[PDB]
Ligand binder design. Structure first.
Ligand SMILES: CC(C)(COP(=O)(O)OP(=O)(O)OC[C@H]1O[C@@H](n2cnc3c(N)ncnc32)[C@H](O)[C@@H]1OP(=O)(O)O)[C@@H](O)C(=O)NCCC(=O)NCCS[C@@H](S)C[C@@](C)(O)CC(=O)O
Ligand SMILES: NC(=O)c1ccc[n+]([C@@H]2O[C@H](COP(=O)([O-])OP(=O)(O)OC[C@H]3O[C@@H](n4cnc5c(N)ncnc54)[C@H](O)[C@@H]3O)[C@@H](O)[C@H]2O)c1
Ligand SMILES: C[C@@](O)(CCS)CC(=O)O
Lengths: 410, 376
């Protein structure tokens, strides 16, 4: 497959869809799911959440140029904000010239928390649990034989203590569970419930919360990118100057949480729409992302940006990325299934790797604009329709002055 | 308005929609938006983002029972995950018996950062910049006379310095901007780019980033809720015991970031679907939320949970909440406009207050379920 998508930006939605259909060999019925509204039937929507009165659409787009470990990939994105898809496609275009994005991921390990209270000896109780960890792990795995046959299952436990809280001593056991192609929530919650009575017997305490942690720091996905100065040169700025500016932007994010929040928001502009497109839980991914960003005791940047020994700009993104191909609404939504088909992913960790490549590209796009002509020239041009509506035209403002004041005057 | 919506959970989507239309007096055209698929025309969708090939639906629901400062409100939500809408609705029902949710909010103030590098005397330059803030403020306000005519605009400047970075000292000016009924990002970004040359002239450095901060801690929204023990009694547990269990769950979130992340995730389960329903940017709300949670250098709980002197469970949520009634895609999407119609909100800060009430309710519902589940 070739993901360059020639002239995609200027094709109609229908023509874009036909091209995508041809590249992938989509059936007429697959294409019909995007060519017509209503792919999520009301009986499905009504069964997904409560008090349903209809459905709500967001645009479904495809970012171009992405390449993951040498293979071209098409990336579906669902979001309401302009310039995101364009920026991601642009930075992916640049990345192609230098090998695309290089990615990897850890095993899909999730934490299941079991909170224990009502004991005066939590530090001792912790050792009692660790002494009998095999028995606990076996009980957890008895509860899900299928997962174990699929190559997943509870691998280990860790135990943490909070002996002095304002509500008294607490002990917290974590089951560490390989959840294969699931996000993992229902899978691990069931194991936490199963081990609870055994943990009460071992410790003499009372189990309270049995629940996954969204701080999924053992389920990491990683992306790398490289950009050369010749690629970043503009009429106003040398490529070398742009790279230095991007490093200045990165250091700013690393020291100031007011910047880091926005910097990381820019990453999630790329990631969350891929999560939505695949029927996955975007709140979970957001919580894992931002909590991980403060793991040091300072809220910093999820990405890294440096200059290598050849003067090239090199970036990384390593972060928690709990996603599924099964579970939740990933199988329920016909377009979630179509998105997975478009992506070509065969494991959840493969989707996770695409997600961090997109987030890395997204961050790069923001920083490149910010370090050069500023964010407004390119972004507001694609927002110009919205400005015309707010004012009460779009082509005229595209003369580099997209402001409501100007729209009012015209 | 009466938001109780008796029997709502068991009615058909069509009957639910009818009951909503009656209560609000929705027009025929408004009801027709939700009745037939494809409310976002492709012409509109194709203009909103790039490389569009279609649209993607999520369920559109209404939470019941919410009451904000004594006034009943209906809350539209767009999300894929079960239990959220029911939990919000049920906790809202319990809240009604004790006066509903009480809310307040700050003015709609947003930060715009201007980063300046290569200054030899950044601490001195900061005072030089501050001394001339009125000029800078005036210059910023020239870019948006419409905003100023409506009572918004740049109000002040603050300046921060970072002495220790690997790339040298940095001066960071913040424009403080009242953005009225907009979320404000594009608004303040234009101002930041507009004042940068003048700042550069005053400080002698090189301007780099000109960009809003998503850590919108001058745009706070607040909610309170109260629940009595009698409301929380179950077959297995006294209401008093459940309250103690909820306080234990809260303390767990306050000390352990592994729990806090999940706890806060539950809050955003309530908030983000309202943000989506009103055509607002949910990445901005998420970033402000989680960054605010760790402003102390420890990632903790956004909510608080306490027992008052009468033994009642009392909860708070104070957090950044940048949202708009105008701007972004809020006017462009027909269902975003319908959502705003259903809500009845007249200002962006009113929408922000409803958002935190819904987040608070969702957290309560999540904790209540976890605190009352029997050991198997
Ligand atoms: C791309 C761009 C918008 C325009 O690009 P230029 O005019 O400078 O350059 P051109 O030579 O015309 O195109 C180069 C390539 O870009 C593709 N492309 C361009 N237009 C496209 C379109 N309409 N449709 C589809 N694709 C489009 C296409 O692949 C094209 O290749 P080809 O056609 O030559 O094959 C450019 O300006 C940009 O990336 N801005 C950053 C925006 C951002 O970060 N937004 C996040 C939200 S903002 C906020 S929310 C994020 C943030 C800033 O707050 C985050 C933070 O603070 O860190
Ligand atoms: N990191 C981020 O959060 C970030 C960064 C850049 C852009 N954005 C995007 O910015 C957009 C929101 O920008 P915005 O809120 O400035 O909207 P906007 O730019 O679409 O419109 C704002 C304009 O609306 C006009 N206006 C008319 N009536 C008004 C009223 N009653 N109150 C206030 N303004 C009024 C003003 O002149 C103002 O300049 C979103 O699409 C968001 O996704 C977000
Ligand atoms: C139940 C919860 O995980 C939401 C499920 S999406 C939130 C929490 O644990 O407080």
């Amino acid at each position: 497959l070739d993901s360059r998508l020639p002239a995609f930006r200027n094709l109609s939605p229908a023509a874009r869809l036909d091209h995508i259909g041809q590249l992938l060999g989509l059936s007429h019925d697959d294409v019909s799911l995007l060519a017509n509204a209503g792919a999520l039937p009301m009986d499905i929507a009504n069964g997904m959440i409560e008090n349903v009165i209809g459905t709500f659409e967001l645009p479904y787009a495809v970012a171009s140029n992405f390449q993951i470990n040498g293979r071209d990939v098409l990336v579906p994105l669902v979001v309401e904000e302009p310039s995101i898809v364009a920026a991601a496609s642009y930075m992916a275009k640049l990345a192609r010239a230098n090998g695309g994005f290089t990615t990897s991921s850890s095993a899909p390990l999730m934490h299941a928390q079991v909170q224990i209270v009502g004991i005066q000896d939590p530090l001792n109780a912790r050792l009692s649990l660790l002494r009998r960890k095999d028995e606990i792990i076996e009980l957890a795995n008895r509860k899900d034989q299928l997962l174990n046959s699929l190559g997943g299952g509870c691998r280990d436990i860790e135990v943490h203590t909070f002996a002095d809280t304002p509500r008294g001593p607490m002990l917290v056991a974590h089951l560490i569970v390989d959840v294969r192609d699931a996000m993992g929530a229902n899978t691990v919650n069931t194991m936490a419930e199963a081990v609870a009575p055994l943990m009460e017997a071992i410790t003499g305490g009372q189990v309270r919360l049995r629940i996954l942690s969204n701080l999924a720091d053992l389920r990491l996905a990683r992306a790398q990118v490289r950009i050369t100065p010749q690629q970043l040169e503009t009429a106003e700025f040398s490529g070398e100057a742009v790279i230095e500016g991007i490093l200045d932007a990165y250091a700013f994010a690393a020291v100031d949480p007011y910047r880091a929040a926005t910097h990381n928001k820019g990453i999630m502009n790329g990631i969350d729409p891929l999560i939505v497109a695949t029927g996955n839980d975007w709140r979970a991914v957001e919580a894992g992302a931002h909590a991980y960003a403060c793991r040091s005791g300072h809220y910093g940047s999820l990405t890294t940006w440096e200059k290598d020994n050849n003067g090239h700009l090199v970036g990384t993104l390593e972060m928690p990325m709990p996603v599924g191909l099964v579970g939740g609404a990933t199988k329920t939504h016909p377009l979630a299934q179509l998105s997975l088909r478009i992506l070509g992913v065969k494991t959840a960790q493969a989707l996770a790797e695409i997600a961090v490549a997109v987030g890395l590209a997204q961050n790069l796009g923001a920083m490149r604009a910010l370090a050069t002509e500023g964010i407004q020239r390119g972004h507001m041009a694609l927002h110009a329709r919205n400005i015309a509506v707010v004012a009460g035209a779009r082509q005229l403002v595209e003369y580099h002055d997209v402001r409501a004041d100007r729209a009012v005057a015209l």
